[PDB]
Amino acid sequence: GAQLTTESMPFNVAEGKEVLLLVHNLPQQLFGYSWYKGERVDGNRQIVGYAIGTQQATPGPANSGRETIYPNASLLIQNVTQNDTGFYTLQVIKSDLVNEEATGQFHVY
Ligand code: NI
């Protein structure tokens, strides 16, 4: 069980380009992922919830229509704006609801 980690790719993203939040060390027995704007799980800043089983991505309140969650939890943010700079928090939701979070930073220039 390696620590769940996100890595923004690239860390520094040109405005209007894309960043992929890479997800390292997804745990086993997963149900879904959730991405949040900011440094914590906060449903109000939730970008997307992703049901692994049904492969359904549901936008949360922070979804800007630019975010693509992949089945590997990685988050694609396209057409990055200057307001995208900052932290992103993945929650990995496990079937047992013993969930893990990782943050999650990139910088738009
Ligand atoms: Ni800057």
Side-chain angles (χ1 to χ4, degrees):
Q3 173 175 258
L4 181 71
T5 265
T6 335
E7 181 183 358
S8 64
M9 190 47 58
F11 184 83
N12 291 294
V13 208
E15 189 181 2
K17 271 39 198 146
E18 34 295 312
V19 59
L20 187 67
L21 309 180
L22 306 174
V23 175
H24 310 278
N25 309 310
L26 278 174
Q28 309 280 184
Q29 190 52 307
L30 293 191
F31 176 74
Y33 318 118
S34 290
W35 273 99
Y36 304 83
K37 259 273 54 179
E39 294 175 82
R40 59 176 187 112
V41 175
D42 180 351
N44 293 317
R45 305 200 63 187
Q46 184 163 192
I47 291 160
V48 70
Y50 181 71
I52 287 161
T54 61
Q55 308 158 119
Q56 275 289 141
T58 315
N63 209 274
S64 68
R66 293 181 290 110
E67 302 89 4
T68 308
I69 200 179
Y70 280 84
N72 70 352
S74 71
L75 186 74
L76 172 60
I77 306 167
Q78 60 192 34
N79 186 38
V80 294
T81 74
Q82 298 289 351
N83 276 96
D84 286 341
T85 291
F87 297 86
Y88 286 87
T89 297
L90 171 59
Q91 183 173 47
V92 180
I93 294 81
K94 305 226 275 101
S95 311
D96 72 350
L97 287 307
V98 178
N99 300 332
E100 296 167 36
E101 303 73 43
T103 304
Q105 204 185 335
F106 68 88
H107 168 255
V108 0
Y109 61 91

